[PDB]
Structure formats: structure tokens, C-alpha cells
Symmetry: C2
Subunit: 234 residues, 2 copies
């Protein structure tokens, strides 16, 4: 039983104050821990094999509980996997039964064009596995193809993910226009899917539609991981 968590590989500029974006560490900590407590062996991966933390969301500023210890303990299960982070094109998809797409505002840049991660995810899904994605993670769905039909994998599906209202609240909706970046909702409509919104951008909100599982944010990471595990055995 193996799960594969993808990270955004982009960690360049984004924010107006010069600070760089990247991975939101809370997302992968919660997901990694939940998988491994439920009998899965987890590996990390990105399109390039590299990544960085969003600079407005530095680990020590946001991490709490026992995943704070997991991050800081150098020899932990989380750190052994993170140091072993794989490069997408080198990954054998048949090793994994669950694909989990973690995010951060970096996913706005690489995920829609991450052809190798998409290849991995679409193959896992083809063999009867689960594709899961949280926050900006569903951006990986843009260009994600059903091997059999050649149509978008998420066509006719219901998904959730980070809402436009969340970006406005964060004051980054202008950056989306400036840097020609998209939203999960746009990706949904572009690919024949329906987008379902949470009441608030910070809510723990999740959707299971067959073996395609989505969540709104890091606060939804645990629930989306549980949904992914349940979906695999459905």
C-alpha cells in the first residue's frame, strides 16, 4: 500500500512585497501523517524533483502539534521521505494506489503544465486507483487526460478546491490577473467539471466523486486523505 504526494516545484516570485511562493508545508505534514497512520507507505514527488516553502508561510511560523516535531526531528519518517523526494519522470506509477496533489500558491505555475505528474496520476486512476487534490492542487487537472477516452479526466465530475473569494480575501486576486494565473473554478469549467464552493475559504470542506477526491485547503488535508483512503476501497 503506497501513496504518492506531489508538491508544487515552483518557488519563485509571486507576492507584491518580493516574497516568494511555493509549498504550504502544513498540507503535506497532515497528509503524510494521516496516510501512514492508516497503513500506507508515502513517497514525495514533484515535476522537477525540487521545491521550496512559500515565504509568507514559513514552517516555524505555522507548524504546530506533533507534525511540528515531525518536521524538526531530522530522522523522522516525514524527513526521510522528503529527502528522498522523487522526480516525476523517474517514477513508476504502478507502485502507487493513491495520488495526492498538495499545493500552495506555487501550484499556479507548474501544475497545469506538469505533464509527468499528470502521466503518473492518470495511470494510477486508469488502474482503479485514487486521485486526490487539495487547495490549488486541482490545477493539476488542467490537461489531465483519461488514457482511454483522451478527454479530461475530471469531465462530468464534481470537485472542490481553493475558491476565488479566498484569493480576494488574501489580496492576491490582482496578482492572478497580473501574472495570468487561473483558479480551480476556471479549471473545473474548462474541463467539463462542476465546482462546488465551501461557505468560507478556511473551512474543512471535502468532496468524494467516485475515485476523484478534492479539498479546499490545509484545514481540509486530513479529511481529504481519509476520503482518498475510503474511496480506494469503494
Amino acid at each position: 500500500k503506497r501513496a504518492l504526494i506531489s508538491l508544487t516545484s515552483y518557488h519563485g516570485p509571486f507576492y507584491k512585497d518580493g516574497a516568494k511562493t511555493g509549498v504550504f508545508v502544513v498540507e503535506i505534514l497532515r497528509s503524510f501523517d494521516t496516510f501512514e497512520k492508516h497503513g500506507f507507505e508515502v513517497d514525495f514527488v514533484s515535476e522537477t524533483g525540487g521545491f521550496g516553502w512559500d515565504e509568507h508561510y514559513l514552517p516555524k511560523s505555522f507548524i504546530g502539534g506533533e507534525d511540528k516535531m515531525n518536521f524538526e526531528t531530522k530522522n523522522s519518517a516525514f524527513n526521510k521521505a522528503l529527502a528522498r523526494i522523487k522526480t516525476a519522470n523517474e517514477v513508476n506509477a504502478s507502485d502507487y494506489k493513491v495520488f495526492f496533489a498538495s499545493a500552495g500558491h506555487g501550484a499556479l505555475f507548474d501544475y497545469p503544465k506538469a505533464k509527468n505528474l499528470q502521466d503518473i496520476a492518470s495511470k494510477i486512476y486508469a488502474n482503479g486507483g485514487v486521485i486526490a487534490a487539495i487547495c490549488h492542487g486541482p490545477l493539476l487537472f488542467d490537461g489531465l487526460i483519461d488514457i482511454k477516452t483522451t478527454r479530461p479526466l475530471i469531465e462530468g465530475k464534481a470537485i472542490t478546491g481553493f475558491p476565488l473569494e479566498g484569493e480576494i480575501a488574501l489580496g492576491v486576486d490582482d496578482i492572478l490577473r497580473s501574472r495570468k494565473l487561473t483558479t480551480v473554478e476556471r479549471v473545473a469549467n474548462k474541463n467539463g467539471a462542476k465546482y462546488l464552493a465551501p461557505i468560507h475559504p478556511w473551512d474543512d470542506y471535502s468532496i468524494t466523486d467516485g475515485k476523484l477526491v478534492t479539498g479546499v485547503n490545509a484545514n481540509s488535508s486530513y479529511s481529504t486523505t481519509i476520503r482518498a483512503i475510503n474511496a480506494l476501497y469503494s
Copy 2:
């Protein structure tokens, strides 16, 4: 100024193996009424017959507390005044209301799929640009609910949630659904061309907004569903 209509199940007869009668789950109407009122909506109640009864496994005294208890037990509270004024469905003018809210309880299994007057009110409210909301077994009212613009079932092409079969199994009433040939929300969704999206647990606060069609799983979802219903009205 702005008015909401909360429907109750009409049925309060036999259901459980221990001889207990089913009916309304009071927490559903108490919580939705309050949330509507606190947001400036005047609220009226309705059922298909004009009558109702509390589910005997969920008697109010055994399940209410705080200002829910207060609102229920205070003789001239806004909740009690509206409940004593419960309307009969065929007498209701649909154009008065901007939101239809179907509360439930296992009683909904018996009358809701065939409550043609309630179905008429809801469709008209929907046609006039209003919102349809439903929690728990409430979405059973959607069975054969016609969109006047399409001629087809209103929930066709829509995403909904509601009380899962998993919930009936945990409650040990799933065998009663087979004996008495009663349905589930999931089965109503698939029969009317809708997609059913399940909660992780049958007791979760879980709700969906799809345009102006709003659904929740249970009483723990009634607040969130009412909020979603209000929000959807101005969408």
C-alpha cells in the same frame, strides 16, 4: 419583507420495530427557523396535510438544550407562534416566499416523494429566482419535482447531499427500508438524474450549494445549510 418557508413531514405513523412512531426531528426546524430569523427572514411552517408529529425516538425533551429548549418551551416565542400557525400546502401562496426549506426525520420517507402540493410551492419559488434547500431525508421531496422551465426533474444535472444509507445501517433501520419498500436520498438522486455526494460520516455537518439548490446531511448540518440557502439567494 423577506420570507422563508420550512416544510415538515406529514407522516407520524409506524416505522420502528419496537412499535415507536416516526415523524419530525424537532432540532431540524428549531435550528433552521432561528438562523433564518436572526438573518432577518420572517418564517412560516407547512406540511402536505397541515399536520405533523415528533418522532418518538427523538422526542424534543430528550434532544434539546440552551435557547433551543427555551424557544421550544416558551409559549409565545416566535418559533411556537409559527408552529401553531402551520399551513396546509395546497393553501399556500408560493410567490410570498424566496426560500423553501425541507426539514425531515424518517417520516419524510413516507410522504415527501408524493407531496405534490409541497412540490408545487418549491418549483414555483425556484422558478421565481428563489432557493430550494433540504436536509437529511428532506431531498426525498425532489423525487418527481419538476422544473417548470425544463419540464424535467428540477435536480437533473445537479449535485446534492442528504442522509446516507450508511446512516440507516448504523441506526439499524435499513431492513425497515427494505420491508416497507422505502428509498434513500442517493437512490432519488440517481433516479432523477442528479449526482449524490456523500459525507465522510452520517453525523457530519455537511452541505452542498449548487446554484440555487442547497442540501445538507442532517440536524448537525441545518445551520450551515440555512446559511448556504441565504447566501445562494443573493448569488
